[PDB]
Design an enzyme around this catalytic site. Structure first.
Site, PDB file in Angstrom:
ATOM      1  N   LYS B  10      25.555  -2.173 -25.800  1.00  0.00           N
ATOM      2  CA  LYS B  10      24.955  -4.392 -25.520  1.00  0.00           C
ATOM      3  C   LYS B  10      23.445  -4.980 -26.681  1.00  0.00           C
ATOM      4  O   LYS B  10      22.543  -4.381 -27.340  1.00  0.00           O
ATOM      5  CB  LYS B  10      24.000  -4.390 -24.892  1.00  0.00           C
ATOM      6  CG  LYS B  10      24.680  -6.390 -23.526  1.00  0.00           C
ATOM      7  CD  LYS B  10      26.082  -6.420 -23.994  1.00  0.00           C
ATOM      8  CE  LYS B  10      26.413  -6.360 -22.325  1.00  0.00           C
ATOM      9  NZ  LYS B  10      27.690  -6.548 -22.331  1.00  0.00           N
ATOM     10  N   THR B  57      28.416  -1.177 -21.355  1.00  0.00           N
ATOM     11  CA  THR B  57      27.563  -2.158 -21.847  1.00  0.00           C
ATOM     12  C   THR B  57      26.431  -2.928 -21.020  1.00  0.00           C
ATOM     13  O   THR B  57      25.618  -3.238 -21.533  1.00  0.00           O
ATOM     14  CB  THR B  57      28.130  -2.590 -23.293  1.00  0.00           C
ATOM     15  OG1 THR B  57      28.698  -3.438 -22.315  1.00  0.00           O
ATOM     16  CG2 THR B  57      28.696  -1.743 -24.187  1.00  0.00           C
ATOM     17  N   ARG B 176       2.693 -19.503 -62.843  1.00  0.00           N
ATOM     18  CA  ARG B 176       3.680 -19.678 -61.847  1.00  0.00           C
ATOM     19  C   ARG B 176       3.781 -20.141 -60.615  1.00  0.00           C
ATOM     20  O   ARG B 176       2.273 -19.542 -59.819  1.00  0.00           O
ATOM     21  CB  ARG B 176       4.827 -18.986 -62.016  1.00  0.00           C
ATOM     22  CG  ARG B 176       4.738 -17.652 -61.374  1.00  0.00           C
ATOM     23  CD  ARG B 176       5.912 -16.097 -61.415  1.00  0.00           C
ATOM     24  NE  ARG B 176       5.951 -15.616 -61.273  1.00  0.00           N
ATOM     25  CZ  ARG B 176       6.690 -14.134 -60.676  1.00  0.00           C
ATOM     26  NH1 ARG B 176       8.257 -14.617 -61.125  1.00  0.00           N
ATOM     27  NH2 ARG B 176       6.871 -13.626 -60.478  1.00  0.00           N
ATOM     28  N   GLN B 228       6.513  -7.163 -57.425  1.00  0.00           N
ATOM     29  CA  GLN B 228       6.704  -5.598 -58.011  1.00  0.00           C
ATOM     30  C   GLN B 228       5.038  -5.325 -57.396  1.00  0.00           C
ATOM     31  O   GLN B 228       4.877  -4.161 -56.802  1.00  0.00           O
ATOM     32  CB  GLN B 228       7.327  -4.952 -58.821  1.00  0.00           C
ATOM     33  CG  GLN B 228       8.709  -5.231 -59.140  1.00  0.00           C
ATOM     34  CD  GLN B 228       9.274  -6.093 -59.333  1.00  0.00           C
ATOM     35  OE1 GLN B 228       8.411  -7.417 -60.200  1.00  0.00           O
ATOM     36  NE2 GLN B 228      10.480  -6.273 -60.434  1.00  0.00           N
ATOM     37  N   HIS B 256      12.118 -18.896 -56.181  1.00  0.00           N
ATOM     38  CA  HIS B 256      11.991 -20.035 -57.101  1.00  0.00           C
ATOM     39  C   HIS B 256      11.601 -21.392 -56.766  1.00  0.00           C
ATOM     40  O   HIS B 256      11.947 -21.820 -56.030  1.00  0.00           O
ATOM     41  CB  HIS B 256      12.788 -19.514 -58.339  1.00  0.00           C
ATOM     42  CG  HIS B 256      13.458 -18.370 -58.386  1.00  0.00           C
ATOM     43  ND1 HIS B 256      12.502 -17.084 -58.841  1.00  0.00           N
ATOM     44  CD2 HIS B 256      14.701 -17.372 -57.669  1.00  0.00           C
ATOM     45  CE1 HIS B 256      13.005 -16.183 -58.957  1.00  0.00           C
ATOM     46  NE2 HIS B 256      14.125 -16.057 -57.956  1.00  0.00           N
TER      47      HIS B 256
HETATM   48  O1  LIG Z   1       7.586 -11.043 -59.777  1.00  0.00           O
HETATM   49  C1  LIG Z   1       8.818 -11.032 -60.479  1.00  0.00           C
HETATM   50  N1  LIG Z   1       9.979  -9.780 -61.128  1.00  0.00           N
HETATM   51  C2  LIG Z   1      11.276  -9.531 -61.486  1.00  0.00           C
HETATM   52  O2  LIG Z   1      11.620  -8.662 -61.518  1.00  0.00           O
HETATM   53  C3  LIG Z   1      11.411 -10.748 -62.053  1.00  0.00           C
HETATM   54  N2  LIG Z   1      12.266 -11.351 -62.711  1.00  0.00           N
HETATM   55  N3  LIG Z   1      12.495 -12.846 -62.871  1.00  0.00           N
HETATM   56  N4  LIG Z   1      11.668 -13.090 -62.261  1.00  0.00           N
HETATM   57  C4  LIG Z   1      10.854 -12.102 -62.091  1.00  0.00           C
HETATM   58  N5  LIG Z   1       9.478 -11.922 -61.121  1.00  0.00           N
HETATM   59  O1  LIG Z   2      35.562  -2.652 -23.857  1.00  0.00           O
HETATM   60  C1  LIG Z   2      35.018  -2.489 -23.752  1.00  0.00           C
HETATM   61  N1  LIG Z   2      33.826  -1.678 -24.105  1.00  0.00           N
HETATM   62  C2  LIG Z   2      32.375  -0.801 -23.165  1.00  0.00           C
HETATM   63  O2  LIG Z   2      32.191  -0.223 -23.757  1.00  0.00           O
HETATM   64  C3  LIG Z   2      32.486  -1.670 -22.136  1.00  0.00           C
HETATM   65  N2  LIG Z   2      31.231  -2.049 -21.453  1.00  0.00           N
HETATM   66  N3  LIG Z   2      31.098  -3.181 -20.054  1.00  0.00           N
HETATM   67  N4  LIG Z   2      31.874  -3.751 -21.183  1.00  0.00           N
HETATM   68  C4  LIG Z   2      32.918  -3.095 -22.111  1.00  0.00           C
HETATM   69  N5  LIG Z   2      34.412  -3.065 -22.270  1.00  0.00           N
HETATM   70  K   LIG Z   3      12.634 -12.026 -58.868  1.00  0.00           K
HETATM   71  K   LIG Z   4      31.449  -4.122 -24.167  1.00  0.00           K
END
Ligand SMILES: O=c1[nH]c(=O)c2nn[nH]c2[nH]1
Ligand SMILES: O=c1[nH]c(=O)c2nn[nH]c2[nH]1
Ligand SMILES: [K+]
Ligand SMILES: [K+]
Ligand SMILES: O=c1[nH]c(=O)c2nn[nH]c2[nH]1
Ligand SMILES: O=c1[nH]c(=O)c2nn[nH]c2[nH]1
Ligand SMILES: [K+]
Ligand SMILES: [K+]
Ligand SMILES: [K+]
Ligand SMILES: [K+]
Ligand SMILES: [K+]
Ligand SMILES: [K+]
Lengths: 296, 296, 296, 296
Positions: B10, B57, B176, B228, B256
């Site tokens: 779930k 589930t 920048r 980086q 940017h």
């Molecule tokens: O910080 C940056 N890293 C990058 O790889 C990059 N490429 N264009 N501008 C950038 N600025």
């Molecule tokens: O199709 C289903 N699969 C499941 O595992 C399930 N669990 N509750 N209801 C469900 N329905």
């Molecule tokens: K970048």
């Molecule tokens: K389910």
């Protein structure tokens, strides 16, 4: 067929601006997303393929950058007013400029207990917005707001005494979780033009602060009878602390957290006073709205 | 045709848990989204419609809630280990449990300078995650991480000296903007089982703090030669401050911010040392990755 | 500390290409989003601030556009192979190119029963993707896939006979709704290089069609015993119809639709054979995975 | 302080309904997301913590399911009217019901050239929506719409003759790409109540079809002078084909596709008549709006 209403422009224009203090070396950044839609004697662009009346949306985009370069971008209420006024003053046939601005958060970083001169962090998706409508001959109408303010309180929220009939299954409660995304808007008194807006500049940041502070404190301290009752308290307090605001509007979703009955498993007690583990509900959600004004 | 690999369970199970201190009245909330996928002698469910080997589930979902009710949900490394161990110990034919947990932020609110006992705020979309793989006979493998940490520095970022050929147009720069969404992962030494994981519990929160702190300080203070070079410095520092970690991996997008030449408009200067207004670029974005380990 | 693994490049590069037939006037459009990450003798860019080993990601972006301009962009398997090969052949120190391509749908519009020469519609968010890993001295590894194919069947889906213990609450059913988002991947036999990839070009579109067709027909006609059993049938059929594929992998969420008991309201019957109105569940969701290969 | 406006209810209520023909065995599915907000004498819930006036949003949710169980869910205009009418007739103090419905696509699958009796596919994120406002004493106001209809034409779109001044950089073009997400709304004449809405039921699906057909054909065949000119043609045609509609509104983003100058690389020609590879722009985007009505 005839044009009954029409507006056009550029939406989602991202804008960043930096201020560098040559004296201290401290830099401050501002980022927003702007939308400008224009109204005026432009019906012929729709009915006769007459583009002569069209100020290209691309040009509107350029204008947003140019205006941001030559003017302060804060408070947003001011920037929006300056930008909107430009369009109705520059083009004789344009009679209304609708400016929406969404301000993004870039809070200065604190490193080792000291504010850093040029590093910022996006602390929250919360936004501060403005809708500035500049209408020729009718001044400037401004709606300020905060949105995306997500909060939760684990207790001191109640909901009982509601109508009960054949469609009701909800159990009354005197202790529940309350979580919401706050969307609060305060509408300003109409301003006659740029001069008046400028004359009240300090009030914009101050009122936003007031609204946010009242929101947080009221949410945290009110032993809520309902979302409705709590949001009203927020609104009335804001109106009482800023005379230049005419109305305060709140739109709040009730983001439900359901109890989980686990008694079927070894008699495990997880409801009522024993409730510890809850199931947050993505949907549906209650939606509560209210517009509060001053009484006559 | 034959099953070469298979796992099921779930996903997207939202879980909230509250702790209430009866002595102080202070409440603390925890919210996460959990995914549990199981592996084992289940091939026949796929090849012969044999559901007898399937732990529903839906049952896995119930188990997540039950386990959260009877055990601490923090640190996530511990909860994930407990949850994963349950499946391989309870069901003889299940030999591996893969537990992923995304922890959401609910930071205690400060009202009038005082921490509130039961009100919280979602300050940032930043998440703290864990991937806990419990394999029968092979202990517990844990990968801890922080993601969605969005930052920006307005200067002290450079990029020059890169390869230049017929495909190159990028201008070298000595000043920048640098903005990214930090995704950092630290892989722990294999643990023999729950007892060993429990014996190191304090180290989980401590190492997450170290990783976040090193990330923020290095980002803010390094006059970056490239993404980086800067990310490597972060990784080596983290490895030096936690002996139980084997590798540190970073995945960083270079979000940017382009300069906007406005000289075509009244000779407006907005480039180079005059750059104030920028155009944030939604896409594309550079993507820089590195996995750093200890030298032999 | 030492670099154990590293790759970098440009992600989210949007690309559109149009083909115009001068003879018929018919135009055909292609749109995709490309990511290219490179590996090689680049460790020094991380450890010594040595950018001389860096082919700028901006240059990688330019190269994507240039390659799209001078080569066919379809099938994506071919374009990815050409693009990846370019990097390991052009730069002596780059030994691996990892190319991911997401193809967006632009289906030709039918107007008044006739295919339009230059108008298209985005019919579905379904994507056709490829992951092409070009490794120097180790040929070209290609994984093709379809994703975002959302379907639903209102009956002829069952789930009974599963393990039942103290954690089980799920009721067995012989008639339920089954809805999912299909993510299917077929891994090709390693190709020695561009010549071999080109020699099999027709098989790419043909196999994608086969996979989609088998998926849809099997989903619609199989009186499903479980998601597991149904997905296996799809995989085995695909492997039987394309000898050049080594494995077929499926990742399927079980998007639950819950019955709604309304008997509390005027004895309204809406469960079992009377079930008409259901509550679609956004979360959680079952997640079922399987990788099927050929038996020895 | 006093309440000037207020409405509340449940939003994002997902609803699925299946119809099973016992004679043919053919099943038909419907899925939507519903929001119902109520207005009335409810001010005291906000001002005095008086929940007696509140029909719980949870009850509103139950009512949506119950109404869907006992009534047709299509056309959405009808379902919305029935649902809205229920609230103002059942509760004396509720004077307005605002119902929004988003209809999701579940198109019947064709297998081997034959329509399948119970298998469906989500072909497109396009939605069909309705906003039904039921106001006591003022009938029923309905706004129908289609949204998320994404299209693109590779030629036969132009834009020249627009205003050119010191803020203009956009080059005139007689051949460009035009792509948009269609959001079209047709507002119906006020209906006196449920009986009148029911009397016009066939017109709802018919008008939606007309709107979609006019949209697609006009987009594909109009050698567009601008988005403005093209959208107007769509609106006037729709008004001419359905007398019961009062206005037609269009909101269209101009999703830009920029040419890429590659002449810097070996004199590669990719602009003007040589343009083949384009860069789709995520933002910003032009936004063009128009509301067209009948002339007097
Ligand atoms: O910080 C940056 N890293 C990058 O790889 C990059 N490429 N264009 N501008 C950038 N600025
Ligand atoms: O199709 C289903 N699969 C499941 O595992 C399930 N669990 N509750 N209801 C469900 N329905
Ligand atoms: K970048
Ligand atoms: K389910
Ligand atoms: O169709 C268009 N309408 C406009 O208003 C516009 N402005 N720039 N480009 C444009 N294209
Ligand atoms: O605060 C609340 N207001 C409401 O109107 C409501 N309805 N159900 N639960 C509710 N909680
Ligand atoms: K004017
Ligand atoms: K509610
Ligand atoms: K076992
Ligand atoms: K090489
Ligand atoms: K009434
Ligand atoms: K435009």
């Amino acid at each position: 067929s005839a044009v009954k209403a029409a507006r056009y422009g550029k939406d989602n224009v991202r804008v960043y601006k930096v201020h560098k203090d040559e004296k201290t070396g401290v830099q401050t950044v501002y980022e927003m997303t702007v939308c400008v839609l224009l109204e005026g004697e432009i019906e012929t662009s729709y009915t006769k393929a007459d583009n002569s009346v069209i100020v290209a949306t691309d040009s509107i985009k350029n204008t947003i950058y140019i205006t941001a370069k030559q003017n302060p971008v804060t408070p947003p209420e001011l920037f929006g007013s300056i930008l909107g006024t430009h369009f109705i003053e520059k083009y004789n046939h344009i009679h209304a400029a609708h400016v929406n601005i969404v301000c993004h958060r870039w809070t200065r970083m604190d490193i080792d207990g000291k504010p850093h001169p040029h590093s910022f962090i996006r602390d929250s998706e919360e936004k501060r917005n403005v809708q500035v409508d500049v209408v020729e001959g009718k001044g400037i109408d401004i709606k300020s707001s905060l949105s995306g303010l997500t909060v939760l309180k684990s207790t001191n929220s109640q909901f009982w005494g509601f109508l009960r009939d054949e469609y009701t299954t909800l159990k009354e409660t005197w202790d529940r979780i309350l979580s919401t995304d706050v969307d609060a808007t305060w509408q300003w008194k109409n301003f006659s033009g740029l001069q008046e807006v400028r004359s009240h500049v300090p009030k914009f940041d101050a009122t936003w602060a007031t609204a946010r502070e009242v929101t947080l404190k009221t949410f945290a301290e009110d032993n809520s009878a309902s979302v409705q009752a709590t949001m009203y308290k927020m609104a009335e307090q804001i109106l009482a602390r800023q005379q230049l605001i005419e109305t305060v509007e709140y739109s709040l979703p009730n983001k439900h957290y359901f109890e989980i009955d686990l008694s079927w498993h070894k008699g495990l007690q997880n409801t009522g006073k024993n409730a510890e583990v809850f199931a947050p509900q993505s949907d549906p959600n209650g939606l509560i709205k209210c517009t509060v004004g001053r009484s006559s």
